[PDB]
Write a protein that binds this ligand. Structure first.
Ligand SMILES: CC[C@H](CO)NC(=S)N[C@@H]1C[C@@H]2CC[C@H]1C2
Length: 209
């Protein structure tokens, strides 16, 4: 059972800008998604200090980068707090409306797309390189869900039937045809060293066989 929702008008406007604007510094998407993973890991770690049972769904706190040349997908896995069903459909987009609005006013004032993280909407920079984004997430208080959007003004949410995650978020980027450089090992290493050298959790690059 799949439910289809419409993006909030400001978010759909931002996504259309991100895909259609000519902007060559696309590598900032990985910094934004790693920063998102670091924030999610900070939250579950903070919550576990007063309730250690929140780590029953997994003690390890890490970020995994998994490129797949065959599927042309770059996957970013974290064992953070995860996202509930209300997070995917309503609450996180509601928090993002103001940041989205301010980001586009800035872009009209000559600001750069690379400053998307300062407005707390850095996730949508994934569409700089991805034609479709699939998000598998599991929160301690909810079931495992699958969020997906190829932009165009709509996204889908469904209960995920695949492999159980325990807890965390998996961001699967279905890369555009001309953005396969982010499946290269040495390219991912350069981006992580340049943008994410100060993340307080282990970032592991999965080398393909
Ligand atoms: C980067 C912050 C921004 C705030 O809205 N996005 C987050 S934290 N999550 C989003 C909600 C849906 C599930 C993943 C995306 C789409």
């Amino acid at each position: 059972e799949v439910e289809t929702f419409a993006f909030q008008a400001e978010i759909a406007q931002l996504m259309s800008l991100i895909i259609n604007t000519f902007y060559s510094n696309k590598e900032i998407f990985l910094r934004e998604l790693i920063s998102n993973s670091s924030d999610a890991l900070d939250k579950i770690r903070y919550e576990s200090l007063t309730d250690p049972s929140k780590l029953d769904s997994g003690k390890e706190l890490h970020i995994n980068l998994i490129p797949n040349k065959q599927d042309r997908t770059l996957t970013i896995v974290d064992t953070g707090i995860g996202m509930t069903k209300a997070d995917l459909i309503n609450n996180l987009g509601t928090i993002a409306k103001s940041g989205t609005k301010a980001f586009m006013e800035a872009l009209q004032a000559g600001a750069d797309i690379s400053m998307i993280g300062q407005f707390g909407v850095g996730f949508y920079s994934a569409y700089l390189v991805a034609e479709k984004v699939t998000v598998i997430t599991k929160h301690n208080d909810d079931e495992q869900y699958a969020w997906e959007s190829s932009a165009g003004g709509s996204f889908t949410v469904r209960t995920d039937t695949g492999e159980p995650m325990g807890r965390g978020t998996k961001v699967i980027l279905h890369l555009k045809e001309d953005q396969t450089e982010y499946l290269e090992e040495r390219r991912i290493k350069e981006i992580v060293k340049k943008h994410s050298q100060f993340i307080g959790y282990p970032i592991t690059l999965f080398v393909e066989k």
